[PDB]
Amino acid sequence: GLGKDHEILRRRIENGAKELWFFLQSELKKLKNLEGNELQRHADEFLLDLGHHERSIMTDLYYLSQTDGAGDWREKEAKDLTELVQRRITYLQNPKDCSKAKKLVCNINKGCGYGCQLHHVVYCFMIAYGTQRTLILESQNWRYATGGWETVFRPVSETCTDRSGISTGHWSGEVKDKNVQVVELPIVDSLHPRPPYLPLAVPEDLADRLVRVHGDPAVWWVSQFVKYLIRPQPWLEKEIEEATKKLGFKHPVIGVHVRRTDKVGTEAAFHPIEEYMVHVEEHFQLLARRMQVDKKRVYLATDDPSLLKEAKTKYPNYEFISDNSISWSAGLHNRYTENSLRGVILDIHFLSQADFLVCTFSSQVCRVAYEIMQTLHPDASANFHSLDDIYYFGGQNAHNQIAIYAHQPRTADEIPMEPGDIIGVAGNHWDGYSKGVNRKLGRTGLYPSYKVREKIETVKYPTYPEAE
Ligand SMILES: CC(=O)N[C@@H]1[C@@H](O)[C@H](O[C@@H]2O[C@H](CO)[C@@H](O[C@@H]3O[C@H](CO[C@H]4O[C@H](CO)[C@@H](O)[C@H](O)[C@@H]4O[C@@H]4O[C@H](CO)[C@@H](O)[C@H](O)[C@H]4NC(C)=O)[C@@H](O)[C@H](O[C@H]4O[C@H](CO)[C@@H](O)[C@H](O)[C@@H]4O[C@@H]4O[C@H](CO)[C@@H](O)[C@H](O)[C@H]4NC(C)=O)[C@@H]3O)[C@H](O)[C@H]2NC(C)=O)[C@@H](CO)O[C@H]1O
Ligand SMILES: Nc1nc2c(ncn2[C@@H]2O[C@H](COP(=O)(O)OP(=O)(O)O)[C@@H](O)[C@H]2O)c(=O)[nH]1
């Protein structure tokens, strides 16, 4: 059978879309006949009406995702897959005889901040998993905690944290390293040759189940290594519990990460508070169509300790949840300390727990929070708005899309496409256009975002059947 609610909602979406098309073509024909102030006023009233109409269609699509048991099914399937992957990682990480285990050695001390260093460990872990090597994490003299990883997180194994082997060598590829018991992996920036066990590909054995359950299987797969790595020590778990209570952290909330200080001009622009808060307001308008919004609440994470005062002053209708001493702790004077380490971990935790995330994906901090968010919901792939980049994993293989409809360029800034063309995406301008390279032409420019599909890449990974 099909579900009655499913059929009602599908037809309501289709009728809602058709009515939006009738409304668009009528109101745009009217706009053409106006000028100056009447044109401004008409356009503004039109945008307000379109926002409500658009949000009704998105609300119906949310209900369609849940109806007739689909929500319960998605939650059960996502749980089954996480448990499966976590069991395979635990099995890899816990050989019975550490002496005789194949191993991959990772050093945490890359020359960068916490999110960049966590992503380096994820990259090491994913290649460990692909090559059937126990991950050994070397973390003495960590700039955030001289005592290492186990200052905050559980060790990465219970049975095998020792580097002993009959042979050691620097990574030279799976074929040359086949009989080398312990391989040392460099940073992805220096890795040659590259093995296939890198983002944004996903394991061939899971790909059908992942595409069915999740809008971005690449992030979900990265998130399973993040989930395993950041298992907290009991003292940190107690600190998060009591932080939750003391901050009055509560739902609904929108996470906002504002990255300023040394990021600006090197790796990102300065974005004013108003640019984040436009998307927070829009998302609360959407949530209010399907739930009670007690108070509009924002969890603010920032390395600018003057921002919180600014935000409260400009948005007195909003409840801001923030630890301003964490913001202070993140300045360049204090950043590489255990105090600042606990601060970034807490900010990332609360961001990742929010209903929605507004930030710059140019920041490794926001990307870690978005990856953790994937572990907390069946499919949180769409629960963000980036002011700059799309999701990426530094060191990833080429992010390709496939043109599904033809594009004839209207300006020289646009690229042509025919269906089938491989597009290397550089980003989404959040205005209906993306920028990328039509591979076949080597032309870079703009294309309508709706005219491409994501190319899921799969890789033959080990499946660790003895983990069952
Ligand atoms: C030695 C050492 O320790 N080095 C560390 C270093 O590892 C560490 O991390 C690096 O930080 C910089 C952040 O500055 C990262 O640079 C940014 O990388 C992204 C992602 O690029 C990949 O994916 C995109 C699609 O999202 C794609 O277009 C790219 O080509 C690229 O894919 C590549 O394909 C190859 C095929 O084999 C692979 O071999 C490569 O591995 C793969 N590359 C990577 C890096 O994975 C990129 O999007 C960013 O570019 C934007 O930002 C810069 C400014 O920083 C602008 O100059 C660019 O024009 C572009 O701007 C964007 O343009 C879009 C389209 O118009 C807009 O929509 C966006 O809004 C706008 N964005 C911005 C911010 O303006 C950067 O290139 C690098 O990935 C990090 N690497 C790792 C491993 O973590 C840094 C951390 O600070 O410390 C060093 O010390
Ligand atoms: N507590 C806290 N620290 C931050 C914040 N934003 C930046 N930082 C600090 O600055 C570092 C920036 O390095 P990294 O995490 O690699 O991210 P990126 O430079 O933003 O891409 C973080 O790891 C923190 O140490 C924040 O919102 N809160």
Author numbering: 107 to 574
Quoted passage from the original study:
Core-fucosylation is an essential biological modification of the N-glycan core in eukaryotes (except for plants and fungi) that is performed by the inverting α1,6-fucosyltransferase (FUT8). FUT8 transfers a n l-fucose residue from GDP-β-l-fucose (GDP-Fuc) onto the innermost GlcNAc of N-glycan to form an α1,6-linkage. FUT8 is the only enzyme responsible for core-fucosylation on mammalian N-glycoproteins. The acceptor specificity of FUT8 requires the presence of a terminal GlcNAc moiety on the α1,3 arm of the N-glycan but shows a higher degree of flexibility on the α1,6 arm10.
However, the lack of solved ternary complexes has impeded to obtain mechanistic insights into the glycosyl transfer reaction or reveal the molecular basis of the requirement for a terminal GlcNAc moiety on the α1,3 arm for optimal catalysis. Here, we have captured a ternary complex formed between the human FUT8 (HsFUT8), GDP and the biantennary complex N-glycan G0 (see below) by X-ray crystallography, uncovering the molecular basis of FUT8 catalysis and recognition of acceptor substrates. The resulting crystals allowed us to solve the structure at high resolution (1.95 Å) and interpret the density map. The asymmetric unit (AU) of C2 crystals contains two molecules of HsFUT8 that are arranged as dimers with two molecules from the neighboring AU by direct contact between their corresponding N-terminal coiled-coil domains. The structure also reveals that GDP is partly buried and located exclusively in the catalytic domain, while the inner part and the α1,3/α1,6 arms of G0 are located in the catalytic domain and the exosite formed by the loop β10–β11 and SH3 domain, respectively. Residues 428–444 (formed by a loop and α10) experience a large conformational change (the largest distance, close to 22 Å, was observed for Gly437 in both forms) that allows the partial closure of the GDP-Fuc-binding site and which protects the more hydrophobic part of the molecule (the guanosine moiety) from the solvent. Furthermore, the loop β6–α8 (residues 365–378) is partly disordered in the apo form and suffers a conformational change in the presence of both ligands, leading to an ordered loop that contributes to the formation of both the GDP-Fuc and the acceptor binding sites. The guanine moiety of GDP establishes CH–π interactions with Ala436, Val450 and Val471 while the guanosine moiety is tethered via hydrogen bonds to Tyr250/His363/Asp453 side chains and Tyr220/Thr408 backbones. The glycerol moiety is a fucose mimic that occupies a similar position as found for fucose, and further interacts with Arg365 and Glu373 side chains, and AG0 OH6, the site of fucosylation in G0. In particular, Arg365, Lys369 and Glu373 contribute not only to the binding but also to catalysis, with Glu373 acting as the catalytic base for AG0 OH6. However, the terminal GlcNAc moiety in the α1,3 arm, EG0, is the most intimately recognized monosaccharide residue of all branched sugars.
